[PDB]
Design a protein around this ligand. Structure first.
Ligand SMILES: OC[C@H]1O[C@H](O[C@H]2O[C@H](CO)[C@@H](O)[C@H](O)[C@H]2O)[C@H](O)[C@@H](O)[C@@H]1O
Ligand SMILES: OC[C@H]1O[C@H](O[C@H]2O[C@H](CO)[C@@H](O)[C@H](O)[C@H]2O)[C@H](O)[C@@H](O)[C@@H]1O
Ligand SMILES: [Fe+3]
Ligand SMILES: [Fe+3]
Lengths: 192, 192
């Protein structure tokens, strides 16, 4: 059975960019719920003996929604860090310059894609088969994990539950918080 | 251009089922934004002389999302009332009995459809061409308004911004709030 992974930091380690209350609800309730739901759905199908990744890449309906959300949220927590934020570094910093010319241009590009991602969704930084970086948006539970030759490197949850408590309807403010927490170490690990 | 309709009741008239704060944000911010965005999209276009309903029936992309959302929210505010809630009455009450056998069975059926309506969505009570009632779900900005032979009678906003302030992640509690506010007068009006 799948388990809710531990948060990689203290529930108040992302303050004041993402509050303790948001973390307890988002990770403690929302993330957990997907875990419970998936476990409830798999026994009795050809999924109970497969990994989360295998499942997301071979399912649909409720099995996929819950499984993918589990994967998406775990990737999301890793994309944040009390030690992140600021300018990118290492491989990813240069890759960002290679694609967009500058970190700033990349930042405005991603913010534009995220603020305009309609409804419940996710905005991703991915590495394409050609080796370049790019920004893609997914709806609901969809994820680039299912795109062949596409490697997820960083993600930002744009479902309203991810920011409503701290920023209400202002995604731009939420995004400023995201840039203050972005985990470049996780990005680079995923990049290399 | 289009304008934000006034709320059909005092900003605190839905307490304690839906907070004054939720209405301030939901209607004053979210709904309003849909109006400004549309107004910013239609000038010098084939949609500048059209009525709201006409636009939702002949658009896609950004124009559709914004227009339909303006319509859905206006329909939603009308589906609530400080003097609603309780047992259904008139034509709708009897039509409800005709389809589900009982109001309680209907309530459980709608609750089920609403709680499982994945992502940003709407759950609708609609009247079909054969005069019967039924429950349907739409995602993001989709609406029964564009379905031939389908007459919307009541709707519940399931986007997280509709209830996150007052109920956080618990849709069932939000739904109990809905049932204490359901505007049966509006329902019968739409039904007849
Ligand atoms: O896991 C339950 C179902 O979730 C999805 O369907 C629900 O959410 C949809 C919107 O995202 C609604 O259109 C639908 O009516 C709901 O039942 C999923 O598509 C289904 O396959 C799941 O069984
Ligand atoms: O109105 C702007 C656009 O909104 C939608 O597209 C955005 O939101 C989608 C998810 O709902 C994303 O997939 C997409 O990447 C975003 O640009 C709509 O589908 C577009 O036609 C609108 O132009
Ligand atoms: Fe989330
Ligand atoms: Fe809404």
């Amino acid at each position: 059975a799948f388990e809710l992974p531990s948060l990689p930091y203290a529930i108040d380690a992302l303050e004041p960019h993402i509050s303790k209350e948001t973390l307890e609800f988002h990770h403690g309730k929302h993330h957990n719920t997907y875990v419970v739901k998936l476990n409830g759905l798999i026994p009795g199908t050809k999924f109970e003996n497969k990994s989360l990744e295998e499942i997301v890449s071979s399912s649909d309906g409720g099995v996929f929604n819950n499984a993918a959300q589990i994967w998406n949220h775990t990737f999301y927590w890793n994309s944040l860090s009390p030690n992140g934020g600021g300018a990118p570094t290492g491989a990813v910093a240069d890759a960002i310059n290679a694609k967009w010319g500058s970190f700033d241009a990349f930042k405005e590009a991603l913010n534009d894609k995220a603020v305009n991602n309609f409804g419940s969704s996710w905005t991703w930084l991915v590495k394409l088969a050609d080796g370049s970086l790019d920004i893609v948006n997914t709806s609901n539970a969809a994820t680039p994990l299912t795109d062949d030759g596409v490697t997820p490197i960083l993600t930002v949850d744009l479902w309203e539950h991810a920011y409503y408590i701290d920023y209400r309807n202002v995604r731009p403010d939420y995004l400023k918080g995201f840039w203050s927490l972005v985990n470049w170490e996780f990005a680079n690990a995923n990049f290399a």
